[PDB]
Design a protein around this ligand. Structure first.
Ligand SMILES: OC[C@H]1O[C@@H](O[C@H]2[C@H](O)[C@@H](O)[C@H](O)O[C@@H]2CO)[C@H](O)[C@@H](O)[C@@H]1O
Ligand SMILES: *[C@@H]1O[C@H](CO)[C@@H](O)[C@H](O)[C@H]1NC(C)=O
Ligand SMILES: *[C@@H]1O[C@H](CO)[C@@H](O)[C@H](O)[C@H]1NC(C)=O
Ligand SMILES: [Co+2]
Ligand SMILES: [Co+2]
Ligand SMILES: [Co+2]
Length: 434
């Protein structure tokens, strides 16, 4: 697609700290950009929609290539349309925003310039952030994560995409998502099927795969940390159900691992660690600091800080694994005890280390789940299982929770706030900000 300018595109600024092993941190100035799927897609020389509701224009978009030639992405009114605001080092995303139409949540990328994404090399480094999840009920997910996206959003590889990172193109993740309207400088109209339950969405014939590091999948009830390997490390197109993931009939039939090696302390047995109020180790009614360290072995370490008190990731025992480091012994034990083979099939932490050794883009989002109601995060899943099934119970939410239309109606003022991002060598991010 090209870019159009009927609406101006001004990326909300966002600062973050780059820390050094020598013990000091220096402020960096970036900004955030909304993913292309949220945008108005229209004809290049008129206001006629190329996509509207859950359908493509059959005249502007008779095929993927003609559609991309005929159509452009336009600018976003971040606060008034999308409920996205920033202040200094803080980013807030509202759940439901009513303008001329309804908007639900957002997916945002951290930029390096107005036309390029910031890339982070995670291996050997740690990433710290503060989060307020107090306004996130059952069924919502305020996510902070990394994906192996191109810094230009795909423009150099696919010159029929001239919109680029400035307009939030080029997304990919471990689901190999097929709901994206543009992939590789082509529309996704071929094979398009409208969603049953979401007036704005559908599933196309193509998806967009890449490695994904889920630092933070969370609401006020549950949280998870999850690396996902893919056999191709960076962004790559996939065809139909060969994509696997959420948007295919067969979840596990693709090149990425859509499940990952997940670490959810509640799922692992510590049901007192994270939740609302003073009965939990971490009180989700209050802001908390989350630090994630990527040691060069390929294992992942985690600690938290709240009110000046530090807690390592709680210990878990699973089969012959015991500890609090997410390492290959953990991931192997998890597959043995909970089931599944996707993580190991895709090469495990060794394959995942190829992603963290390269550049990855920072994503912050707020979503509800039109496929599984977020039950995999915060409830019992599948819903016919009980606590007698190892790993079935992931949180205390009812198996009836998280229906998108219901939570949108009941909790429209829900929101997530991410703040005080700090990044640098392991051991460095707790030192004074600059
Ligand atoms: O695609 C939704 C969500 O899935 C997460 O994996 C789940 C999976 O959905 C479920 O079928 C299995 O039983 O459990 C795993 C781990 O909870 C995945 O980790 C997320 O990244 C993804 O957003
Ligand atoms: C949960 O984790 C916290 C922090 O490590 C610990 O203090 C507490 O004893 C744990 N509870 C259980 C049941 O494992
Ligand atoms: C729940 O339903 C699934 C269907 O996929 C089945 O595999 C499983 O055996 C069922 N579990 C129980 C405890 O009935
Ligand atoms: Co194709
Ligand atoms: Co099939
Ligand atoms: Co280690």
């Amino acid at each position: 697609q090209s870019a159009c300018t009927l609406q101006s595109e001004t990326h909300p600024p966002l600062t973050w700290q780059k820390c050094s092993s020598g013990g000091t941190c220096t402020q960096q100035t970036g900004s955030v950009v909304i993913d292309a799927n949220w945008r108005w897609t229209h004809a290049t020389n008129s206001s006629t929609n190329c996509y509207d509701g859950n359908t493509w224009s059959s005249t502007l978009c008779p095929d993927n290539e003609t559609c991309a030639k005929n159509c452009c992405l336009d600018g976003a009114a971040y606060a008034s349309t999308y409920g996205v605001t920033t202040s200094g080092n803080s980013l807030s995303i509202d759940f439901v925003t009513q303008s001329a139409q309804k908007n639900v949540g957002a997916r945002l990328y951290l930029m390096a310039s107005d036309t390029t994404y910031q890339e982070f090399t995670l291996l050997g480094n740690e990433f710290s952030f503060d989060v307020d999840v107090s306004q996130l009920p059952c069924g919502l997910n305020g996510a902070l994560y990394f994906v192996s996206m191109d810094a230009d959003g795909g423009v150099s590889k696919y010159p029929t995409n001239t919109a680029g990172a400035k307009y939030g193109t080029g997304y990919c993740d471990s689901q190999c998502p097929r709901d994206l309207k543009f992939i590789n400088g082509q529309a996704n109209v071929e094979g398009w099927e409208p969603s049953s339950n979401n007036a704005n969405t559908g599933i196309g014939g193509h998806g967009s795969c890449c490695s994904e590091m889920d630092i933070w999948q969370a609401n006020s009830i549950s949280e998870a940390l999850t690396p996902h390997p893919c056999t191709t490390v960076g962004q790559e197109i996939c065809e139909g159900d060969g994509c696997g993931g959420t948007y295919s009939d067969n979840r596990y039939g693709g090149t990425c691992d859509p499940d990952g090696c997940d670490w959810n302390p509640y799922r692992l047995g510590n049901t007192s660690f994270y939740g609302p109020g003073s009965s939990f180790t971490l009180d989700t009614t209050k802001k908390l600091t989350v630090v994630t360290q990527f040691e060069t072995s390929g294992a992942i370490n985690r600690y938290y800080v709240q009110n000046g008190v530090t807690f390592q990731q709680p210990n878990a025992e699973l089969g012959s694994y015991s500890g609090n480091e997410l390492n290959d012994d953990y991931c192997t034990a998890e597959e043995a005890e909970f089931g599944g083979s996707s993580f190991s099939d895709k090469g495990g932490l060794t394959q995942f280390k190829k992603a963290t050794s390269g550049g990855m883009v920072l994503v912050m989002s707020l979503w509800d789940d039109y496929y599984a109601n977020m039950l995999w995060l915060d409830s019992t899943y599948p819903t016919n299982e009980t606590s007698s099934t190892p790993g079935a119970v992931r949180g205390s939410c009812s198996t009836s929770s998280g229906v998108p239309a219901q939570v949108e109606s009941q909790s429209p003022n829900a929101k997530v706030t991410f703040s005080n991002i700090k990044f640098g060598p392991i051991g460095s991010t707790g030192n004074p900000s600059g």
